[PDB]
Design a protein around this ligand. Structure first.
Ligand SMILES: Nc1ncnc2c1ncn2[C@@H]1O[C@H](COP(=O)(O)OP(=O)(O)OP(=O)(O)O)[C@@H](O)[C@H]1O
Ligand SMILES: Nc1ncnc2c1ncn2[C@@H]1O[C@H](COP(=O)(O)OP(=O)(O)OP(=O)(O)O)[C@@H](O)[C@H]1O
Ligand SMILES: [Mg+2]
Ligand SMILES: [Mg+2]
Ligand SMILES: [Mg+2]
Ligand SMILES: [Mg+2]
Ligand code: NA
Ligand code: NA
Lengths: 356, 355
């Protein structure tokens, strides 16, 4: 009952300059191709963790597609290929700290050609999935078709918001969505989408960040999202759920060491925990959030609970920021396990002194 | 006796935003791949004009190489490929006015892996070449090795200056070079490199052709007195200056396609020691200036390779450059030879003596 992953397959061009980029000219640096796209990365990540996902997406019959498919070891049955399709390309120029200085995304093939008509061919895979992961590169209509199919079979849906603009596609599907994984800005954009107004604004301690984000988080939850995971970069992640997180969504290494009886307080309408990350040496930050999703989905797919699974996701994200690839060539399970335990044992409840 | 082309194979990545580029994330837009590198472009251009060149360069066994070689239909014999080589890429992200907002060039493989040793494997091809074209992405040692092999077999050498910085690599090979094709900026840089002092200064409005020539003449003279025989100064929409030691109607000493016959029937060889000529260009609707200087070289080299004289040949090069600026690619997917011929005629007939 494999997890089904639906969304963008993208050829990333990553330009890491040796010094500070300057308008009007080129600086020397390192320019690389990396297999990318949120859905492709998530599927890649899940597979490298020992779980087989089913990928649904679209590619051209062009050079970038060949690069993307060169080492592809999963089924391609879900991949729409047509000659009138241009394989999506993202070009990033980084700053010397590893943050994106300037970027252009050309991903219109996903919005235009990854259609309900293509996706509905796979109603069996979706309705029988352990979980459905959709990214926001899909058009609203594709998103609706996907999420309704999962929903009618009570298959939990993970919505990956992709960007501040695309995250707003939550608006027409929130009731069908079980889990979302925005960063701070995407969370605010999503809240504003669901409010149909620009009521919350973008942007220090964890309690402070949480107090700032809480109203926005509540907006998503009462619009039907059951779990909000707010990724905070080097500050880790927040896990907020409607109801107890263990029965809200509703490996052998991790399960033995990240005890499902560590946390006493495990049903409130807003449950909130902070997960720290682990000090890393960054080669490239791109693809960390995607590996957080991959690692979490893989663990959930193997029967771990959401607190354990997120710990694994955060371990996987750490491994990713230390690679030039979006997803590391390989994961080492002793490292992932070790890191997951650290994150997990370091995780804390928020709203401890509050009671509302 | 194929013309031999040595230098960069580069994947150009052009990122065109739809709106405002933002820190930390992507703006939507269009990203285009264009096969690039001065030498690869020249070889591409020559081939599309009906002449087969021999290309010497270096590529990785990676993704960018796959994209680059997807439509390459020429021999790969001269291309050094290894698994530890990262294929050159220049990545440009534009702003909405059309200027480079941020750009990164990763092209060090040319200098590090296109060595004199690799080049000497093709001494036979070079010594028998009708013409040798080198670009300045080559290391100085690679440049010296190439040009010495050509000189010893009296093969004409065309040096493409590539950029203001790399143009200065002319200094250790000037005596070996027959033809150079700098723009204004590259010309000054090259003259400064060759002089015992930096007497020339950079670039202020545009200005008339006779005046531009007068301003540039001293820098041009520095190149000639250092052994360069022909200086082609490219001037963008103002065409090109052609300055030579001895009269400009020079042909390759070779004992022929349909570029030759179209053009010669139409660009009459009886229309026409420092000689200077101005060649006008032809109004185009620019979609991208990409590839213009390279197709000028490509077109001229192709015409010389088919037996045309330098004057006829430069006229074709200017026609070819015009076609390049009307393409998104560095080199148009195709040339239409009657059109190239028609444009070359205008240029040829519009060209005038300055000195
Ligand atoms: N510098 C870092 N050190 C350790 N872990 C990190 C670091 N940066 C990110 N991570 C891990 O990656 C996760 C997601 O990071 P972030 O919130 O920056 O991703 P994003 O904003 O979705 O963008 P992307 O996924 O492209 O990185 C974080 O929750 C964290 O666990
Ligand atoms: N707008 C145009 N219309 C017609 N011909 C053009 C135009 N722009 C350039 N050309 C032709 O291209 C030739 C080269 O132009 P330019 O001198 O700008 O090249 P460059 O400075 O070497 O830049 P690049 O290497 O990017 O081509 C010119 O001599 C001209 O004949
Ligand atoms: Mg993300
Ligand atoms: Mg995220
Ligand atoms: Mg030039
Ligand atoms: Mg040039
Ligand atoms: Na990475
Ligand atoms: Na062009």
């Amino acid at each position: 009952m494999e997890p089904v992953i639906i969304g963008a397959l993208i050829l990333d061009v990553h330009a890491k300059p040796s010094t500070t980029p300057i308008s009007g000219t080129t600086v020397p640096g390192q320019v690389l191709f990396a297999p990318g796209g949120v859905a492709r990365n998530v599927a890649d990540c899940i597979f490298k963790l020992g779980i087989t996902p089913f990928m649904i997406g679209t590619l051209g019959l062009d050079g970038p597609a060949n690069v993307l498919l060169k080492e592809w070891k999963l089924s391609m049955k879900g991949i729409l290929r047509r000659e009138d399709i241009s394989t999506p390309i993202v070009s990033l120029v980084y700053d010397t700290n590893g943050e994106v200085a300037a970027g252009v995304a050309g991903v219109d093939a996903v919005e235009n050609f990854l259609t309900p008509e293509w996706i509905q061919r796979f109603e069996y895979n979706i309705s029988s999935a352990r979980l459905l992961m959709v990214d926001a590169n899909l058009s609203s209509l594709a998103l609706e078709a996907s999420c309704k199919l999962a929903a009618e079979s009570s298959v939990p849906v993970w919505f990956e918001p992709v960007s501040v603009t695309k995250s707003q596609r939550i608006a027409s599907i929130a009731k069908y969505v079980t889990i979302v994984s925005p960063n701070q800005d995407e969370l605010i954009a999503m809240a504003n989408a669901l409010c149909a107004k620009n009521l919350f604004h973008p942007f220090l301690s964890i309690e402070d960040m949480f107090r700032a984000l809480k109203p926005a988080i509540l907006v998503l939850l009462k619009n039907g999202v059951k779990v909000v995971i707010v990724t905070l970069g080097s500050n880790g992640a927040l896990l907020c759920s409607k109801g107890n997180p263990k029965k809200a969504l509703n490996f052998k290494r991790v399960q033995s060491v990240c005890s499902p009886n560590r946390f006493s307080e495990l049903s409130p309408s807003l449950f909130a925990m902070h997960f720290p990350t682990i000090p890393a040496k960054v080669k490239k930050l791109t693809g960390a959030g995607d590996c957080l999703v991959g690692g979490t989905v893989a663990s959930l797919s193997d029967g771990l609970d959401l607190i354990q699974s997120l710990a694994v996701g955060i371990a996987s994200a750490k491994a990713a920021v230390e690679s030039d690839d979006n997803v590391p060539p390989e994961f080492k399970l002793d490292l992932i396990s070790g890191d997951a335990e650290l994150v997990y044992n370091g995780a804390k409840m928020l709203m401890v002194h509050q009671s509302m």
